[PDB]
Amino acid sequence: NLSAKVVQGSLDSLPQAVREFLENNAELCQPDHIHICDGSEEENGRLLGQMEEEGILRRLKKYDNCWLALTDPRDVARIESKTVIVTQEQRDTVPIPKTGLSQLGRWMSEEDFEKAFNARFPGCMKGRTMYVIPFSMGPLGSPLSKIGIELTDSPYVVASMRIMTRMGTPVLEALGDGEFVKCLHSVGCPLPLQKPLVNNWPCNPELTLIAHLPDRREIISFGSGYGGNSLLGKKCFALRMASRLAKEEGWLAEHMLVLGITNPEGEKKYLAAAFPSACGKTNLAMMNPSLPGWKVECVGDDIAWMKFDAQGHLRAINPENGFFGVAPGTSVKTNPNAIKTIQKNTIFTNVAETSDGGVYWEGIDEPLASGVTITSWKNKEWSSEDGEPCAHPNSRFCTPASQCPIIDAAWESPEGVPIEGIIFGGRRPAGVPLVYEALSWQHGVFVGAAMRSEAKIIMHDPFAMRPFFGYNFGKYLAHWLSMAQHPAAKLPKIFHVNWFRKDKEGKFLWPGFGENSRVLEWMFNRIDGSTKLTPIGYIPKEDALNLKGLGHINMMELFSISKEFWDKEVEDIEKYLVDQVNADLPCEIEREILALKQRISQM
Ligand SMILES: Nc1nc2c(ncn2[C@@H]2O[C@H](COP(=O)(O)OP(=O)(O)CP(=O)(O)O)[C@@H](O)[C@H]2O)c(=O)[nH]1
Ligand SMILES: [Mn+2]
Ligand SMILES: [Mn+2]
Secondary structure (H helix, E strand, O other), X not given: OOHHHEEEOOHHHOOHHHHHHHHHHHHHHOOOEEEEOOOOHHHHHHHHHHHHHHOOOEEOXXXXXXXXXXXXXXXXXXXXXXXXXXXXXXXXXXXXOOOOOOOOOOEEOHHHHHHHHHOOOOOOOOOOEEEEEEEEEOOOOOOOOEEEEEEEOOHHHHXXXXXXXXXXXXXXHHHOOOOOEEEEEEOOOOOOOOOXXXXXXXXXXXXXXXXXXXXXXXXEEEOOOOHHHHOOXXXXXHHHHHHHHHHXXXXXXXXXXXXXXEOOOOOEEEEEEEOOOOOOHHHHHOOOOOOOOOEEEEEEOOOEEEEEOOOOEEEEEOOOOEEEEEOOOXXXXXXXXHHHHOOXXXXXXXXXXXXXXXXXXXXXXXXXXXXXXXXXXXXXXXXXXXXXXXXXXXXXXXXXXXXXXXXXXXXXXXXXXXXXXXXXEOOOOOOOOOXXXXXXXXXXXXXHHOOEEEOOOEEEOXXXXXXXXXXXXXXXXXXXXXXXXXXXXXXXXXXXXXXXXXXXXXXXXXXXXXXXXXXXXXXXHHHOOOEEEEOOEEEEOOOOOOOOOOOOOOHHHHOOOOHHHHHHHHHHHXXXXXXXXXXXXXXXXXXXXXXXXXHHHOO
């Protein structure tokens, strides 16, 4: 009956609860076929071939198996407004702010979401094939791993999920009759198409909704084929749904890279860092350090799940399988390890294409040969003389983590790596020194709670989780505070950096990139136990930062801490936390606020 529609695999081979999930949704969405993904190369090949035939992807012949999706410009990034968490009580999802609307997530009632779903999913996969993707977030097996089943009507999602997660038969095998996160997704355009199709890229911007139901462990997404709205483990699961499980279960789900750094004597420390969009997680995660003899290896570039082990260390596993990298700005100079990574088996989306079948983007800094021309991401012959970038500014590559030439030997180790340092930071043109260290855990929590970044607007982005909180931020701050009470906790040292301080002509005071290894060396050694006390935390003392090999650095401007500026900053931090977190702000945080205004008044 349903079996008749199965074009790959066997209903009878699915665990019962996997099958129910599929049956129910097949009946509701009415796809013409059901394809149970097995995650094999042959299937990947077959899917790509179909995609090429349909116009969904084109081959980049300059490389080994790389492909290019161009989307409808209307479907090109994740939309906050349209992204919601649904719970019976609003408070469980975001705090009720004092004034304004909350900037810490968006809640929808169970009733409202029921109506939104019934207005979108019934019949929505007509004429399409429903793919069933079994996947594991984290190494297959690991005690820190979770599993999801994503149902989808996009072959692009499938092929992208093969890279960003462990996917296929082996996950169904590991799941057995276990629990899983239900994940339902539909590009929202049943055939016959009722509207124009751009670039063969179906989406339904007007009905676009991305929903999370933590209590039912469901993620439900409609209307967009893009990135985080459609690869349901990449943000919906990995951050939103996980941060809630984590809160329930005693661990952490964070917007963090994790790297392993080695000094010239062979001692290795793992660090985690949270920066928001456009702020360089990916560059730091697989940096090539300029300091002679230091080594940096990549564990993950975007997400970290962390859990105290039996001896009190905070262990991180990367629950992703790949890098879903912003492309523009990537170059041999800014991120040579990223460049080597995507040399193969990589899917790109919304970047430009050269006439010899290569990719191109703003900041690639790679001169085209004679007679090579560029086709922009909108499919038009392009030049610099138009006023538009040849790639979308948040275009992506999606590449295997196993191909990073410096992927860490422990990136898949099921026990995770011991985090000895947590780093926070954003873009701040003025006022915030290159690096400082937190005075205590509690202060470190406030430091993350206080993050702002210029996105000419400077916005608050606490912990770089602003679009990703899976529950009430005030409870998230208490949960993080609570770790200082974990029996025998080895608390990671906490730091805040700023690679983007500017002089008055707007030029960067710090060269960054590979030179950030100098900042790392200072944190590595503070971890090993020197400092100068300032009202905001410790900074390096005079001559402590290793500057050999660089050109001039205006160190004094770079570490300059002004009363006027900081009078302003804490006032702004205060007003933001009290209004936005309101009744949920933990008192430890109110104390850290008052204390920093006390320390600053003394200056
Ligand atoms: N000036 C300067 N820019 C930096 C440095 N590190 C990264 N960048 C810039 O940050 C931007 C690239 O950041 P991006 O890759 O978006 O960061 P991400 O944190 O990985 C973003 P996402 O989570 O969405 O994938 C580019 O403008 C690149 O120049 C640095 O040390 N200095
Ligand atoms: Mn990134
Ligand atoms: Mn990210």
